[PDB]
Amino acid sequence: HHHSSGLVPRGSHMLEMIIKPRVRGFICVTAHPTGCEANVKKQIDYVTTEGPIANGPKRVLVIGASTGYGLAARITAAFGCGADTLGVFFERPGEEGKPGTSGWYNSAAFHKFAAQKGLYAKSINGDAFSDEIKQLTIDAIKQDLGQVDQVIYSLASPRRTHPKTGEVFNSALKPIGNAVNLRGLDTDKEVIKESVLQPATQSEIDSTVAVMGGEDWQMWIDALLDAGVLAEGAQTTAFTYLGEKITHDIYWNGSIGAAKKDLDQKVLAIRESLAAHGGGDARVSVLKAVVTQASSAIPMMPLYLSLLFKVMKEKGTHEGCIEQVYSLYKDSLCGDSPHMDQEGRLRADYKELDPEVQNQVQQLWDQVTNDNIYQLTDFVGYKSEFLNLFGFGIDGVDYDADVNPDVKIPNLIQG
Amino acid sequence: HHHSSGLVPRGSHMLEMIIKPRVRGFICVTAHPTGCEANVKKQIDYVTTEGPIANGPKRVLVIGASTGYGLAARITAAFGCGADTLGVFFERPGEEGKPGTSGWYNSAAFHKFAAQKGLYAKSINGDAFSDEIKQLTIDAIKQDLGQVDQVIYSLASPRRTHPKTGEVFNSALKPIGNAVNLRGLDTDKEVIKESVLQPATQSEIDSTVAVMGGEDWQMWIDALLDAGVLAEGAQTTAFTYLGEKITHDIYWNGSIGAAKKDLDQKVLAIRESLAAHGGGDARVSVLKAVVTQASSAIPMMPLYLSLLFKVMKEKGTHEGCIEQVYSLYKDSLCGDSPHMDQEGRLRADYKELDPEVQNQVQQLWDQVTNDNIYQLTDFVGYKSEFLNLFGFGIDGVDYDADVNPDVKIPNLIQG
Numbered sequence: 026h027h028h029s030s031g032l033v034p035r036g037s038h039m040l041e042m043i044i045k046p047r048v049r050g051f052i053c054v055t056a057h058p059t060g061c062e063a064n065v066k067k068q069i070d071y072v073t074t075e076g077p078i079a080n081g082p083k084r085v086l087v088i089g090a091s092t093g094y095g096l097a098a099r100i101t102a103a104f105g106c107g108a109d110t111l112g113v114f115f116e117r118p119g120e121e122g123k124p125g126t127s128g129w130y131n132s133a134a135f136h137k138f139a140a141q142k143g144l145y146a147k148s149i150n151g152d153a154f155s156d157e158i159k160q161l162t163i164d165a166i167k168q169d170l171g172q173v174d175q176v177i178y179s180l181a182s183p184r185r186t187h188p189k190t191g192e193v194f195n196s197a198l199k200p201i202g203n204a205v206n207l208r209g210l211d212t213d214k215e216v217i218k219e220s221v222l223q224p225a226t227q228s229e230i231d232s233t234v235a236v237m238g239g240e241d242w243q244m245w246i247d248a249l250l251d252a253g254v255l256a257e258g259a260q261t262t263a264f265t266y267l268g269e270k271i272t273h274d275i276y277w278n279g280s281i282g283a284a285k286k287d288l289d290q291k292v293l294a295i296r297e298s299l300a301a302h303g304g305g306d307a308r309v310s311v312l313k314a315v316v317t318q319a320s321s322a323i324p325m326m327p328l329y330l331s332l333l334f335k336v337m338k339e340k341g342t343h344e345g346c347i348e349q350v351y352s353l354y355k356d357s358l359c360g361d362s363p364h365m366d367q368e369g370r371l372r373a374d375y376k377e378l379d380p381e382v383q384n385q386v387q388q389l390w391d392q393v394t395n396d397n398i399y400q401l402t403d404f405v406g407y408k409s410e411f412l413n414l415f416g417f418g419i420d421g422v423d424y425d426a427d428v429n430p431d432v433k434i435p436n437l438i439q440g
Numbered sequence: 441h442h443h444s445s446g447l448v449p450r451g452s453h454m455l456e457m458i459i460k461p462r463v464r465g466f467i468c469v470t471a472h473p474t475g476c477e478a479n480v481k482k483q484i485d486y487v488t489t490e491g492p493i494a495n496g497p498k499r500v501l502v503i504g505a506s507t508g509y510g511l512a513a514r515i516t517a518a519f520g521c522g523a524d525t526l527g528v529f530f531e532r533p534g535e536e537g538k539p540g541t542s543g544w545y546n547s548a549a550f551h552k553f554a555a556q557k558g559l560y561a562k563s564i565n566g567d568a569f570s571d572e573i574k575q576l577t578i579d580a581i582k583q584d585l586g587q588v589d590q591v592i593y594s595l596a597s598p599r600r601t602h603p604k605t606g607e608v609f610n611s612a613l614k615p616i617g618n619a620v621n622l623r624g625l626d627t628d629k630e631v632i633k634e635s636v637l638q639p640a641t642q643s644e645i646d647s648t649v650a651v652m653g654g655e656d657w658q659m660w661i662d663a664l665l666d667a668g669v670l671a672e673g674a675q676t677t678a679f680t681y682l683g684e685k686i687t688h689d690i691y692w693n694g695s696i697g698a699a700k701k702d703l704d705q706k707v708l709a710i711r712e713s714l715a716a717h718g719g720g721d722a723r724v725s726v727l728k729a730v731v732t733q734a735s736s737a738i739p740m741m742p743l744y745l746s747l748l749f750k751v752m753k754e755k756g757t758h759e760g761c762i763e764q765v766y767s768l769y770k771d772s773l774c775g776d777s778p779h780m781d782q783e784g785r786l787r788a789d790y791k792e793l794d795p796e797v798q799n800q801v802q803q804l805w806d807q808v809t810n811d812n813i814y815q816l817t818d819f820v821g822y823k824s825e826f827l828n829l830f831g832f833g834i835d836g837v838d839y840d841a842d843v844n845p846d847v848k849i850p851n852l853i854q855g
């Protein structure tokens with residue numbers, strides 16, 4: 026009620042909103058629908074440009090398909106191999122006044138671009154750890170594809186509800202055995218903070234292994250196998266990171282590392298199951314450190330990546346998710362001579378572990394301070410890549426314009 | 441529900457919003473709380489700078505006090521004469537997701553700045569045409585001031601509900617007798633549109649006089665008088681515009697002009713009432729054309745003002761609301777020698793009616809086209825002034841930042 030009330034249409038501004046980056050730590054509480062779409066198209070375009078990949082799979086299940094490496098797999102499979110993709114993820118739909126998660130908009134754009142190139146895209150939104158979601162996934166494969174010939178396992182979560190026990194496990198990102206003096210990056214104030222991270226309880230290590238270890242991967246392959254929806258000679262891989270000695274106290278030999286080691290264990294039993302089924306295979310694929318929602322949350326990583334970006338950009342070996350996963354498909358998943366390591370893992374992370382990069386990064390680490398951040402490190406590149414995750418800082422996108430956050434997805438099974 | 445749901449605070453972004461100009465025609469559906477505040481402070485600052493005005497009123501009622509000329513009076517009275525001001529207006533409070541009107545935020549900032557300088561500020565929000573609002577206004581004067589010594593009548597509305605009949609009159613902005621070929625400015629496409637405005641029915645002229653004529657002004661003075669809340673020797677003025685021959689077909693000799701003429705009629709009876717009461721007075725004050733919500737809605741005005749701004753800026757006589765009203769107080773309402781005209785109206789609009797300005801404007805009018813708008817006219821200045829009304833384009837204001845639209849007002853009587 027004012028003096029000109031009702032003599033004037035409210036218009037669409039009432040249902041739409043201006044969406045801008047809102048960052049606290051490694052958390053961004055907003056996502057831009059138009060920019061996620063454009064970010065995804067950027068990745069699709071990269072794969073299209075590099076060109077088709079021969080000897081690729083044709084019916085692919087990606088578990089964790091909405092963001093980061095899982096999305097990059099979905100795009101590589103789809104636009105590089107022409108594969109049909111069934112994506113499983115866990116994301117918040119957008120609604121009025123309330124932007125959905127990144128993953129939601131990424132997947133909406135994925136379905137859109139897939140349809141444009143005549144590719145199959147269906148997705149399932151819900152807890153991948155649950156039996157219910159597994160069943161829904163099997164039914165979808167049954168009805169539409171008959172079988173899948175590749176299963177990409179790409180989950181990153183801070184928790185898991187055991188499909189059998191009631192128990193809710195929580196992921197812990199601590200060091201093991203001994204406390205660590207962390208010299209990190211405060212991303213908001215843009216200074217060097219200095220922490221001390223206490224090592225994890227056994228109880229926490231067990232929880233981290235339960236979340237990010239290989240049990241669920243195993244449960245998935247088994248469920249798929251005995252529903253008969255896995256093709257003979259099928260291939261499944263789960264992503265992991267090794268890093269080098271600088272990251273080791275926190276990651277590889279930390280609690281998250283304990284989980285990733287459980288991975289190398291479970292992959293044996295799973296490989297056995299796929300070997301028996303028409304000469305199939307199961308590998309752990311090691312990828313380089315990139316900026317994603319998962320890696321951001323890892324202590325030391327923001328500064329590590331800031332440095333890593335600087336060195337590798339100079340060296341010319343800098344890549345993100347989509348380049349990593351494309352080359353993982355081309356060189357190792359589909360290629361003649363695969364990059365196998367001593368443990369029998371595929372490898373795409375070697376350019377990062379180049380001893381020249383690691384030494385150059387290491388000597389820059391102890392010597393970074395509040396005055397030289399923008400000269401010793403590519404903190405700028407990092408920030409930009411972080412914002413990119415959420416659809417921000419994209420070129421061609423008008424962030425001052427109204428956008429409707431209520432973006433729906435065709436052929437989206439909601440569980 | 442996503443994978444990291446609840447492990448993360450939503451934060452204030454949930455209740456706040458980014459507010460940007462949203463303009464369709466002479467309508468802007470948003471207003472910026474921080475910018476309205478800053479716009480008001482700009483005006484206050486101007487008055488403070490020019491310096492105190494001697495011989496001013498001390499207890500002032502401003503009817504139509506939230507925007508445009510009425511606000512400018514409220515600020516001049518308050519910050520130039522140190523007067524206590526009781527403001528009457530009709531505005532929409534802000535709430536979450538829904539910016540209030542300009543006037544609302546203007547008044548919130550007014551109460552704020554007034555309190556800072558120890559001045560009295562109370563306002564009443566509701567229909568000034570109604571008896572109820574008049575009563576509420578009288579009670580407020582009774583309780584806090586005893587009496588007012590100045591009544592500024594500054595209403596601009598497209599309608600009026602007669603306080604006695606049920607009848608709802610609607611204001612019409614048409615020419616009289618004969619149709620008009622209007623050469624105007626399309627403000628969105630930024631081209632020259634060309635219309636044909638049919639003259640108004642008698643029925644519409646009567647409605648326009650009922651809305652913007654002097655009946656309500658009269659009803660106000662009377663109501664005040666016989667409640668005994670008007671001081672002896674009180675002064676009341678109502679604002680009007682005359683313009684020159686270019687504006688005459690649409691304004692002065694149009695339907696709105698019929699109303700403004702009813703003003704000159706009613707002011708006689710009202711002056712008689714104030715003369716009898718201790719030597720008081722009632723005048724019609726004529727002000728120059730400025731950019732406001734009221735004038736924007738008037739055909740031909742956008743282009744007229746665009747031109748007028750250009751010429752007067754060059755001449756150095758360009759002013760807006762606050763300069764007009766300050767000088768109206770200084771020179772004519774409070775000053776020794778008042779600018780009285782043949783009809784006995786006060787005048788602040790003379791710099792506009794300078795025959796040199798009007799001729800220069802006129803020869804530019806027929807000769808403006810889609811290619812020369814940004815060189816023949818100050819369409820830029822116009823747009824900026826228009827945006828300023830709603831708190832936009834203000835310097836020092838971060839329009840990318842979240843702002844809470846729920847801004848409340850102390851000592852605000854809501855009717």
Ligand SMILES: NC(=O)C1=CN([C@@H]2O[C@H](COP(=O)(O)OP(=O)(O)OC[C@H]3O[C@@H](n4cnc5c(N)ncnc54)[C@H](O)[C@@H]3O)[C@@H](O)[C@H]2O)C=CC1
Nearest residue numbers: 089091093094115153181182264265266314315317319443
């Ligand atoms: N980010 C890096 O630097 C590297 C990442 N990785 C690994 O790649 C994998 C993926 O990590 P990112 O792509 O970085 O993380 P991410 O946060 O971008 O993606 C996680 C994906 O899993 C989904 N997800 C999480 N919980 C789920 C649930 N309960 N049910 C269904 N979907 C769920 C998300 O929706 C999303 O699609 C992980 O194994 C991670 O350790 C390995 C090498 C380095």
Ligand SMILES: NC(=O)C1=CN([C@@H]2O[C@H](COP(=O)(O)OP(=O)(O)OC[C@H]3O[C@@H](n4cnc5c(N)ncnc54)[C@H](O)[C@@H]3O)[C@@H](O)[C@H]2O)C=CC1
Nearest residue numbers: 028504506508509530568596597679680681729730732734
């Ligand atoms: N804008 C111009 O170029 C000129 C304006 N004027 C006159 O000055 C007066 C004010 O006009 P502006 O300041 O331009 O318009 P405006 O739209 O800025 O202000 C109108 C004011 O009256 C209030 N109002 C409208 N209806 C109301 C109602 N039913 N109850 C209570 N309050 C109500 C609004 O809240 C606002 O405070 C009018 O008489 C107008 O004709 C005269 C000379 C030129």
